[PDB]
Design a protein around this ligand. Structure first.
Ligand SMILES: CC[C@H](O)[C@@H]1N(C(=O)OC)[C@H]2CC[C@]1(O)CC2
Length: 284
């Protein structure tokens, strides 16, 4: 079926939970043996969220190459994404090592450091220009260059230096600051505006390594971001945009990381975002 009318048909019939459970039943199951080794327990935020072995990002280190991060490679859309958990106190150096080694331009953060009165990820970037951060375990230096605070999101320019080689690179930090502590946003308008700002920066384009996207577990809000982006790109590429099947795209993405889209409310919100976004693209 088309999307917008399949949407109203699920609303009128109140069957979002059943649609979402079908996705959960059909989703791929691949091994994640490296994630479960005892030496990696303090590298995982949640025991039930792990990268598959076949798609995990490997650190360029011979001691321990593990990070909780997955490469989502979308062949028809010609987009790739790295989805990862919010860094932990003992993985902030690994996080920036990955950004460096994978040649990423942008980092997309969809959570606040504290939500619901608990810490959802480490304070992994510097908050003042004159107070830079050094990660001694991976030999990197990170400096805040500039910060632009807007009503729904903040953009930061960061400098990452590889202290071994003295090479430097500019990284863009896109921080969506207004996702509510509970539920999903009422309108997708600010989330779409944010997506378009990431796109306009070059961070999603083939001349760079894959964008790094995270929330707390790296599957819920993060899944919503890449699902919406890929679906809108396919609607621009194809002769028949109504052939884009959001459930099929989501199942394809779940071949590369488990659990993408965590609730039926997140599924409904993804539909809403793609539907509204398709009108603004045109040609609107
Ligand atoms: C809209 C521009 C974009 O956000 C970037 N920026 C920034 O922090 O934006 C708030 C700096 C200067 C322009 C940039 O494109 C590059 C770094």
């Amino acid at each position: 079926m088309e999307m917008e009318k399949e949407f109203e048909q699920i609303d009128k019939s109140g069957s979002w939970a059943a649609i979402y459970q079908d996705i959960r039943h059909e989703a791929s199951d691949f091994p994640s043996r490296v994630a479960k080794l005892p030496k990696n327990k303090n590298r995982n935020r949640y025991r039930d969220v792990s990268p598959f072995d076949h798609s995990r990002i490997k650190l360029h280190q011979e001691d321990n190459d593990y990070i909780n991060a997955s490469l989502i490679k979308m062949e028809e859309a010609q987009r790739s994404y790295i989805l990862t958990q919010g860094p932990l106190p003992n993985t902030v150096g690994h996080f920036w090592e990955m950004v460096w080694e994978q040649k990423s331009r942008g980092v997309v953060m969809l959570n606040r450091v504290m939500e619901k009165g608990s810490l959802k990820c480490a304070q992994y970037w510097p908050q003042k220009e004159e107070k830079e951060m050094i990660f001694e375990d991976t030999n990197l230096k990170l400096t805040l260059i500039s910060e632009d605070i807007k009503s729904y999101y903040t953009v930061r320019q960061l400098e990452l230096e590889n202290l071994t080689t003295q090479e430097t690179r500019e990284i863009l930090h896109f921080h969506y600051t207004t996702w509510p502590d509970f539920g999903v946003p009422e309108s997708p308008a600010s989330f779409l505006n944010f997506l378009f700002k990431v796109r306009e920066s070059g961070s999603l384009s083939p001349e760079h390594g894959p964008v790094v996207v995270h929330c707390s577990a790296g599957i819920g809000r993060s899944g919503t971001f890449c699902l919406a982006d890929t679906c809108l790109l396919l609607m621009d590429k194809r002769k028949d945009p109504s052939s884009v099947d959001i459930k099929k795209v989501l199942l394809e993405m779940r071949k590369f990381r488990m659990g993408l889209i965590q609730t039926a409310d997140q599924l409904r919100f993804s539909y809403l975002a793609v539907i509204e976004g398709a009108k603004f693209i045109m040609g609107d």
